[PDB]
């Protein structure tokens, strides 16, 4: 796992632990896991474009990784999709999983769509950031922002929910509203 | 829009397979395919509620399997009480997620 | 942009050892793996081995386990390969390709003259067609690999260029006529309208959890 | 858990018909209710569906029932009313009222008796 | 050295974090009198020379490939000891 | 230096703890033949000079303010690595 | 988090890790988390007085902290309260949460009372000690002793249950038996 | 020095393990495109001089008595920090 | 807990941490927990003989210990037993507990038998190895191999299920098929 | 002991709010306030089972809110079938936790 | 094969204990012992579904306890409505796990 | 949740009898169904048991009902049929149909009405 | 008991620097925060800053960020504040108050002569009443703070004394006539029967997750 050491106010990937004795780790407070959203990287934040990056698969257990520090998200998503017959499509959020804390917009996307897998993964391999946990799957009725987690060594509010009605979630023939 | 054979037939001792051809949006889109046994004069009875999963209270003889864009229903150990129309039910990615039923296969016991 | 500048040509005598250093720039060198490919004259692309700058871990093909040694330097951001017991047939053109974030050797280097493994084989080596027609190149995989398949074209006198880095994920800047699609063990690379500039040797590479990233046999148009 | 359908008397080709679906033991507002048309000598034809009150309270209909058919729900008596405006001769057959209710990973339809409609 | 390969980098890093756990507190440390789960976060801005931010968005991008493999190997639903293991790995190799 | 501000201190500390995990055992280490959850605890008395006890009841009082803040920041339902983190923090700062 | 180092058989709060090289931590066995009850501190152990220190709140997730060593409790509590209409008032004890092991008296307080929050917290900020875990909330039908947890570095039985019937739990108008 | 008291030792140790987490990967690191839970394991054979295997089957036998006591003391349903604690104990005693 | 250090390609039990500075622990990758099955030790793999080593007890909570590396098992077991009246006999496998990955044979033993305890323990004190976790109890409908876990410091496929019908599981009067 | 207005009235298109004043022990003690729709000739029907939570099978038109020591019931989109007595139900901290019902508001549709 | 006393009797104010002797396979093998109240003219009603656990809807007066290879049913505060045959039900390790019922105790209220 | 038994008419000592058990609200295929014989002036006699379709679809019988008695199940109408071949005079009494259904740790038998058999 | 003994008076000339050391005893010095309050003559209490002996972390008011520097010594158990660029108006009476376990500056020191922040303002500065009457002092909070509100009385010539350390939590030894109650953003301090010894300046301090612990304007009876 890559690590980040802030040398002279400049971040460098610590791929080798034998870098230099200049790097100091006095306490665990210097170690921090920052979860940065993908919106900063410039990816498309549109609902018809963001949902194409999410795919359903079966056989891969969900995994959750903790991150302490987060990034303010200007575009969050709240999937409440269900199967066309009314069956549940996304697993319920377990204890300790809450919505993303800071969200300028919460794209609450509801509707119907095919659910070919027990869990909804990210096609780009990124995580689904939550209140303080990063999960590889999407939980039902929980605000999340698709993002990535970085581990580094530190040196010594209103949400506007947007309603969507999606038919055919996860397919190239998808209609919104 | 998904199609079914007009009718099927098989010996009681043999295993009868009922075909159901869909498309990229009906069955190729990942939608679950359901099978119904429509006994005459009574409401249809669900037999398979997913690609392979079967509801409780349904005999183990009825088994289903989805391959590619088509789904097949297998009836092993056929009896004389299964002579009824079988319908293939799924959903379409097009048409804004509307249920699509097959043409119906009238299984006949020889 | 990513530029993998490779070393100059060489004429070392048989039995000696030559160290070909390929400089990498425009990206974090330690983050991406470095792969070396040997192209015999008019034969095809042969994968030699891979080196990970992050950890120093290196893997080679069974034939190249002893012939090639891979070392990298983090500070110099340069990957050098040292060969041993060179022969007449060992003299060929060596390419350094950067292993992409998803396993596609997208950026290559300038030509430098000198079972468990997944085997990918193309249907026809010498597909022939006229301009304006539509042809399909089929790549077969021994095991069930994911949609991850890489397609490269290598015009004569130029380094291979990645076109499709997945089943259908098209590299930006590639003409839209190059359309590829496939799944499972079958992958198809199609050209909507073959042109006079599209005739080259096409290679199929599978990148899905397989340490040997062997290329395909080839397809000359 | 059972469902019953009411209505379906003989209707002239020019007119309107009302179909009432009632259930005991299951709340219609909490589950998605589907309507299917079973014409004589013809396969099952899914016509409409109403979502639960927890989700969007809107009804989806097929092409033949796009505008002619309208569905209303009365939560006071947990009854679902299907209004069939501008009826036609082709709208003949048994109309069923069923819902896919999933419990502990297993789902059942709980089909109703089904009312026959003659035009 | 970090080379940001992202098409666009956001120079401003508006970050949310929990309380410092060592800062001045009054009656809010008691869960009964404390704020809800939303109110415990403290916000800030980290427009730090623009080099520490664009290189952080690239470090997170590269960390994902190794982090996904690490989570796949682990058999635990939730992982909280990544920092603890990193501290152990750093300290074991330092040996001082 | 610990000053006990509590109105009353109990000089005797009757403590219960699990088994030493390195002491002599017979067939009780097998869960099938071992005791129930209640029987695994071993009791004792810690009337140690009365200064180690009244200062411990005050250390626990002061630890609560920081521990509550630490638990509030953590997103895990149960925390078991407080001692492990303390060992890491002690060893990282020692650097030897 | 304060730490305790037993210097020459005397405990001192280790607020600074740079105290002295005399302090030795050879193994994790020296590290120990002792959960001391509040009865030793001299607080009121009466049921009408103890229940006033417990309050119900919503929005604060429960937190559990492990402690190895404990203290014998002369006054334990077992809340089985329910809402006046028969609804559940306290969350069920999850797996791994058991009653306090050593209790001279178990004040099993049952009855009805208002439940304004999903969880019952401690107004003084203390924890609710359990079998081997300290939780900030009260679980239904689980013996507990209100106490606090201390972290320190070590150097190199019959229960009499008492039945209570409380009406108006958590209010100044509360009647017992 | 390990003395194998088992009646029979298997010289060949056919072992399964997860991926190295640092080896070459393609698109399989993405959970959506990656293999299922069964496919992530990599197999191998460890016929290493027959002394490293028969002594390992005896080390595991002796570890059980202490491991069962350790699990009984712990109040957590699942334990993942045994290696982390062992690293801490090794490093704390080394002090360098 | 005993530890194993591979000195000059030879394993020795590290009962003392003061062995020698020759032992090197550069990273946590050297630390590994290998779960070895009991079949290698030469115990009887027959179903009528293996089930005698499993007993039911109540009052002992289940415990799970993680092991990274495992051993290929030539004889695995999948207990699906139930009480004679149809009641559940073994607890359901929680999230994260899966069947043993590599099993040459899976002795799926079903039937009826007495269930005197909430959990089925191992009379020899060994563990029940699973996908990547070692548990002291048996879970319903989950393939497992009875084995033991070893902690060591490293230096610098088709399953044939076998069906069994057992009446009187856990008693000396047991009939199979 | 908690009181209610003797009667309320409102247009079908308007939203009618029904008040319910308690005390420090009725509603100020944290007790949940329940609302019942007592149709004449039939048993009362629960509308709000908590301060804001509503039971399944109850129309979304009926919404409640507790502020301070008083609780209010809001009926949006009033129809002609809601002309019935509405009762405010809560519990009292005094009187040893006994249910207290309101005086009843007879909503009239104009 | 497990035996019961032919009949039992006791005063309504007294507590009546019903014995049930098994063997190493009936009750000594760990099988749960169930008790049934067979009111005349009606189907038997279960009273104890385990060694000590009692099903919901059964009065707390009926309590059971298993000691060694025998099980006892205690009826405290006996009324006149409990005058019916009581059966001891368990399972046998032998006979391939077949249910075994006791001889039946006809409790008589004096 | 209730069970009803059908059949049990007078049968000569030489002959066969069929007993039908039906239930409403509980599926016989999902639970283990037990049959008990209650002869007049005699204690309860457990005769047979059929396991659920999830488990092995085989029926276990006691010594007196080992070969003579055969049990069959019809999932179409959730009815359980007990065939009593080579009947005898001792096979006289009320036959009950009950199942141990466990929910949330508590189990109930849900005994049926019981059909009387006279030989 | 807790005794915060403060240093003696001072007469340093303008432009120099003075270090006022306030000794703390009777409690674990590192456990409780130390707060410094400046009182201008006949004006009110001004919060200067806070220092945490446990970690050395210090925070100051925006006006006092550069004027005051806070340092502590664990061994000496004494808190000293060093001021810079002293002027005529900087000369005032400085009080050291121990931050309580729940955030109430319960114990003060003897007088030593020389937006994001929560603003607490009292309704009337000069409330006047006769003996035996009942009066209420209202404190308003800008944001929704918990029941945590502190009420202090400061008789002329004496250090401020805490009376109510929460909405209604009354300090022991305070006469029962001083009854306070409040919630949310409104807090009321009431005297059942005002006496000749109860006329003093009353201050309102909010202590709920706010690093600036600014006092109230005041209320003289
Ligand atoms: C870390 O940051 C990198 C960026 O450097 C992220 O890489 C992104 O990967 C996703 C998934 O593959 C890409 O989305 C797909 O893009 C293809 C077309 O890609 C081509 O065009 C891009 C311009 O649009 C161009 O930038 C690409 O070049 C980059 O990527 C290649 C391959 O990785 C690399 O070798 C280069 O060096 C560049 O870095 C490339 O030429 C597009 O066809 C896809 O659409 C299909 O798939 C979607 C799936 O949902 C489907 O819905 C569509 O209908 C269609 O079928 C898909 O959009 C994305 O473009 C890459 N980013 C960039 C900037 O190109 C990586 O994901 C980050 N890691 C994380 C987030 O964990
Ligand atoms: C650690 O140890 C400390 C003790 O040093 C514990 O502090 C206790 O806090 C609780 C909650 O605030 C107190 O209970 C309340 O007490 C007030 C009256 O307090 C006054 O009188 C006390 C004598 O009875 C006196 O000791 C107090 O002085 C101490 O506290 C102040 C403020 O913290 C501090 O500055 C001093 O230096 C002293 O340390 C004080 O003068 C009383 O009015 C309250 O009753 C109201 O609230 C209850 C809430 O349930 C309600 O039910 C009532 O109806 C009423 O409305 C309440 O009883 C307790 O008195 C403090 N302990 C002591 C010894 O005074 C602290 O909690 C410990 N930490 C833990 C356990 O984690
Ligand atoms: C969906 O995919 C199919 C199959 O490739 C294609 O024919 C169709 O055009 C696609 N739909 C859209 C809207 O692109
Ligand atoms: C309960 O609180 C109210 C409001 O302050 C008060 O009037 C009443 O007297 C209190 N009850 C008791 C018993 O103190
Ligand atoms: C079972 O145990 C009993 C009691 O010891 C014994 O009598 C019997 O013979 C045993 N059964 C078998 C088959 O050994």
Tab-separated table of C-alpha atoms in Angstrom, chain C:
chain	number	residue	atom	x	y	z
C	1	UNK	CA	2.047	13.020	-21.450
C	2	UNK	CA	3.944	9.779	-20.810
C	3	UNK	CA	7.242	9.418	-22.696
C	4	UNK	CA	9.277	6.203	-22.358
C	5	UNK	CA	12.590	7.210	-23.928
C	6	UNK	CA	14.661	4.095	-24.630
C	7	UNK	CA	18.406	3.728	-25.115
C	8	UNK	CA	20.161	3.775	-28.471
C	9	UNK	CA	21.026	0.924	-30.791
C	10	UNK	CA	23.734	-1.624	-30.016
C	11	UNK	CA	26.069	-3.996	-31.851
C	12	UNK	CA	27.622	-5.974	-28.984
C	13	UNK	CA	29.451	-9.142	-29.988
C	14	UNK	CA	28.070	-12.581	-29.067
C	15	UNK	CA	28.796	-13.836	-25.568
C	16	UNK	CA	29.079	-10.373	-23.989
C	17	UNK	CA	26.397	-8.601	-21.932
C	18	UNK	CA	24.437	-5.456	-22.810
C	19	UNK	CA	22.392	-3.292	-20.428
C	20	UNK	CA	19.545	-1.463	-22.190
C	21	UNK	CA	18.281	1.421	-20.043
C	22	UNK	CA	14.863	2.865	-20.935
C	23	UNK	CA	14.119	6.199	-19.265
C	24	UNK	CA	10.559	6.901	-18.117
C	25	UNK	CA	9.041	10.350	-17.643
C	26	UNK	CA	5.680	12.052	-17.270
C	27	UNK	CA	4.357	9.730	-14.554
C	28	UNK	CA	5.165	8.348	-11.116
C	29	UNK	CA	7.759	5.711	-11.994
C	30	UNK	CA	7.262	3.609	-8.856
C	31	UNK	CA	3.475	3.451	-9.290
C	32	UNK	CA	3.335	1.600	-12.634
C	33	UNK	CA	5.058	-1.658	-13.536
C	34	UNK	CA	7.616	-1.716	-16.351
C	35	UNK	CA	7.427	-4.412	-19.036
C	36	UNK	CA	9.979	-5.331	-21.708
C	37	UNK	CA	8.974	-6.784	-25.085
C	38	UNK	CA	11.295	-8.286	-27.710
C	39	UNK	CA	10.305	-8.200	-31.390
C	40	UNK	CA	12.158	-10.516	-33.742
C	41	UNK	CA	12.359	-9.220	-37.339
C	42	UNK	CA	9.060	-10.008	-39.047
C	43	UNK	CA	7.952	-12.445	-36.335
C	44	UNK	CA	5.950	-10.707	-33.612
C	45	UNK	CA	6.066	-9.393	-30.062
C	46	UNK	CA	7.573	-11.589	-27.336
C	47	UNK	CA	7.042	-10.645	-23.695
C	48	UNK	CA	10.324	-10.814	-21.775
C	49	UNK	CA	9.543	-9.843	-18.200
C	50	UNK	CA	8.188	-7.291	-15.766
C	51	UNK	CA	9.762	-5.226	-12.986
C	52	UNK	CA	7.933	-3.362	-10.223
C	53	UNK	CA	9.799	-0.176	-9.202
C	54	UNK	CA	7.706	0.116	-6.027
C	55	UNK	CA	8.945	-3.131	-4.459
C	56	UNK	CA	11.673	-4.365	-6.814
C	57	UNK	CA	9.764	-7.575	-7.537
C	58	UNK	CA	10.527	-8.966	-10.991
C	59	UNK	CA	9.016	-11.798	-13.027
C	60	UNK	CA	10.196	-13.313	-16.309
C	61	UNK	CA	8.972	-15.749	-18.919
C	62	UNK	CA	10.120	-19.348	-18.543
C	63	UNK	CA	12.354	-18.954	-21.600
C	64	UNK	CA	13.682	-15.596	-20.330
C	65	UNK	CA	14.100	-16.576	-16.660
C	66	UNK	CA	17.902	-16.728	-16.909
C	67	UNK	CA	18.549	-14.749	-20.105
C	68	UNK	CA	17.233	-11.409	-18.806
C	69	UNK	CA	17.775	-9.553	-15.528
C	70	UNK	CA	15.602	-6.566	-14.596
C	71	UNK	CA	16.697	-3.724	-12.317
C	72	UNK	CA	15.345	-0.209	-11.762
C	73	UNK	CA	16.469	2.937	-9.953
C	74	UNK	CA	13.896	5.111	-8.195
C	75	UNK	CA	15.976	8.305	-8.269
C	76	UNK	CA	16.909	7.986	-11.951
C	77	UNK	CA	13.389	6.826	-12.945
C	78	UNK	CA	15.057	4.593	-15.541
C	79	UNK	CA	14.503	0.882	-16.182
C	80	UNK	CA	17.506	-1.110	-17.412
C	81	UNK	CA	17.564	-4.749	-18.532
C	82	UNK	CA	20.796	-6.762	-18.643
C	83	UNK	CA	21.012	-9.768	-20.967
C	84	UNK	CA	23.386	-12.724	-20.692
C	85	UNK	CA	24.668	-15.334	-23.159
C	86	UNK	CA	23.631	-13.301	-26.195
C	87	UNK	CA	23.465	-15.162	-29.511
C	88	UNK	CA	22.631	-14.273	-33.111
C	89	UNK	CA	18.917	-14.939	-32.584
C	90	UNK	CA	18.927	-12.916	-29.346
C	91	UNK	CA	19.652	-9.810	-31.446
C	92	UNK	CA	16.316	-8.074	-32.050
C	93	UNK	CA	14.363	-4.890	-31.291
C	94	UNK	CA	13.528	-4.350	-27.615
C	95	UNK	CA	10.574	-2.246	-26.457
C	96	UNK	CA	9.835	-0.938	-22.967
C	97	UNK	CA	6.109	-0.592	-22.271
C	98	UNK	CA	4.559	0.991	-19.186
C	99	UNK	CA	2.054	-1.302	-17.488
C	100	UNK	CA	-1.121	0.745	-17.253
C	101	UNK	CA	-3.299	1.360	-14.232
C	102	UNK	CA	-5.657	-1.383	-15.458
C	103	UNK	CA	-2.963	-3.586	-17.005
C	104	UNK	CA	-2.699	-2.132	-20.521
C	105	UNK	CA	0.776	-1.404	-21.912
C	106	UNK	CA	-0.499	1.878	-23.309
C	107	UNK	CA	2.806	3.759	-23.665
C	108	UNK	CA	5.725	2.063	-25.428
C	109	UNK	CA	9.317	3.045	-26.115
C	110	UNK	CA	11.228	3.760	-29.312
C	111	UNK	CA	12.645	0.687	-31.022
C	112	UNK	CA	16.103	-0.309	-29.769
C	113	UNK	CA	17.944	-2.647	-32.129
C	114	UNK	CA	20.459	-5.189	-30.854
C	115	UNK	CA	-0.722	-24.606	-18.513
C	116	UNK	CA	-0.664	-21.917	-15.827
C	117	UNK	CA	0.145	-19.186	-18.352
C	118	UNK	CA	-2.739	-17.839	-20.427
C	119	UNK	CA	-2.239	-18.480	-24.151
C	120	UNK	CA	-3.918	-16.014	-26.522
C	121	UNK	CA	-4.056	-17.058	-30.182
C	122	UNK	CA	-5.587	-15.166	-33.098
C	123	UNK	CA	-7.679	-16.961	-35.703
C	124	UNK	CA	-5.842	-15.895	-38.877
C	125	UNK	CA	-2.292	-14.568	-39.161
C	126	UNK	CA	-2.583	-13.225	-42.720
C	127	UNK	CA	-6.061	-11.704	-43.049
C	128	UNK	CA	-6.343	-9.918	-46.400
C	129	UNK	CA	-8.995	-7.429	-47.489
C	130	UNK	CA	-9.544	-4.433	-49.742
C	131	UNK	CA	-10.108	-0.816	-48.734
C	132	UNK	CA	-13.588	-0.024	-47.447
C	133	UNK	CA	-14.449	-3.571	-46.369
C	134	UNK	CA	-15.163	-4.675	-42.798
C	135	UNK	CA	-13.065	-7.385	-41.137
C	136	UNK	CA	-13.015	-8.910	-37.659
C	137	UNK	CA	-9.967	-10.146	-35.737
C	138	UNK	CA	-10.814	-12.861	-33.206
C	139	UNK	CA	-8.670	-13.561	-30.135
C	140	UNK	CA	-9.148	-16.792	-28.182
C	141	UNK	CA	-8.257	-17.203	-24.505
C	142	UNK	CA	-7.423	-20.562	-22.940
C	143	UNK	CA	-9.141	-19.709	-19.641
C	144	UNK	CA	-12.146	-17.558	-18.766
C	145	UNK	CA	-10.587	-14.098	-18.541
C	146	UNK	CA	-12.585	-10.952	-17.868
C	147	UNK	CA	-13.312	-8.257	-20.456
C	148	UNK	CA	-9.674	-7.149	-20.021
C	149	UNK	CA	-8.092	-7.597	-23.458
C	150	UNK	CA	-5.535	-5.312	-25.106
C	151	UNK	CA	-5.240	-4.719	-28.857
C	152	UNK	CA	-2.101	-3.203	-30.390
C	153	UNK	CA	-1.222	-2.213	-33.947
C	154	UNK	CA	2.427	-2.088	-35.051
C	155	UNK	CA	3.029	-0.401	-38.389
C	156	UNK	CA	6.391	-1.214	-39.946
C	157	UNK	CA	9.181	0.906	-38.494
C	158	UNK	CA	7.118	2.133	-35.527
C	159	UNK	CA	6.552	0.995	-31.962
C	160	UNK	CA	3.267	-0.788	-31.156
C	161	UNK	CA	0.345	1.492	-30.308
C	162	UNK	CA	-2.475	0.468	-27.984
C	163	UNK	CA	-5.949	0.834	-29.504
C	164	UNK	CA	-8.423	-0.936	-27.183
C	165	UNK	CA	-7.317	-1.462	-23.581
C	166	UNK	CA	-10.345	-3.589	-22.625
C	167	UNK	CA	-13.124	-5.472	-24.398
C	168	UNK	CA	-14.547	-2.193	-25.726
C	169	UNK	CA	-12.664	0.612	-23.931
C	170	UNK	CA	-11.202	2.626	-26.812
C	171	UNK	CA	-8.044	4.693	-26.354
C	172	UNK	CA	-8.603	8.396	-26.979
C	173	UNK	CA	-7.229	9.645	-30.285
C	174	UNK	CA	-7.710	6.256	-31.962
C	175	UNK	CA	-9.994	6.568	-35.018
C	176	UNK	CA	-13.578	5.494	-34.364
C	177	UNK	CA	-13.316	2.939	-37.189
C	178	UNK	CA	-11.390	0.681	-34.777
C	179	UNK	CA	-14.206	-0.911	-32.761
C	180	UNK	CA	-13.639	-3.907	-30.511
C	181	UNK	CA	-15.975	-5.989	-28.391
C	182	UNK	CA	-15.845	-9.347	-26.659
C	183	UNK	CA	-16.485	-11.270	-23.474
C	184	UNK	CA	-15.436	-14.486	-21.793
C	185	UNK	CA	-12.830	-16.336	-23.845
C	186	UNK	CA	-13.790	-14.717	-27.179
C	187	UNK	CA	-12.795	-11.183	-28.179
C	188	UNK	CA	-13.351	-9.536	-31.563
C	189	UNK	CA	-11.444	-6.562	-32.983
C	190	UNK	CA	-13.264	-5.012	-35.940
C	191	UNK	CA	-12.531	-2.222	-38.415
C	192	UNK	CA	-15.596	-0.529	-39.889
C	193	UNK	CA	-13.710	0.639	-43.005
C	194	UNK	CA	-10.166	-0.621	-43.565
C	195	UNK	CA	-7.921	2.095	-45.006
C	196	UNK	CA	-4.455	2.141	-46.547
C	197	UNK	CA	-3.054	3.428	-43.231
C	198	UNK	CA	-4.707	0.652	-41.182
C	199	UNK	CA	-2.681	-2.266	-42.606
C	200	UNK	CA	-0.325	-3.442	-39.853
C	201	UNK	CA	0.356	-6.363	-37.524
C	202	UNK	CA	-2.300	-6.529	-34.800
C	203	UNK	CA	-1.525	-8.125	-31.438
C	204	UNK	CA	-3.817	-9.451	-28.706
C	205	UNK	CA	-2.715	-9.219	-25.070
C	206	UNK	CA	-4.670	-10.502	-22.070
C	207	UNK	CA	-4.227	-8.695	-18.739
C	208	UNK	CA	-6.237	-10.451	-16.016
C	209	UNK	CA	-4.370	-11.800	-12.962
C	210	UNK	CA	-1.806	-13.581	-15.162
C	211	UNK	CA	1.865	-12.854	-14.332
C	212	UNK	CA	2.882	-13.980	-17.862
C	213	UNK	CA	1.433	-11.277	-20.120
C	214	UNK	CA	2.066	-13.111	-23.377
C	215	UNK	CA	1.029	-11.328	-26.564
C	216	UNK	CA	-0.877	-12.824	-29.473
C	217	UNK	CA	0.557	-14.390	-32.590
C	218	UNK	CA	-0.302	-11.421	-34.791
C	219	UNK	CA	-2.441	-10.444	-37.778
C	220	UNK	CA	-1.000	-8.689	-40.838
C	221	UNK	CA	-3.425	-6.945	-43.191
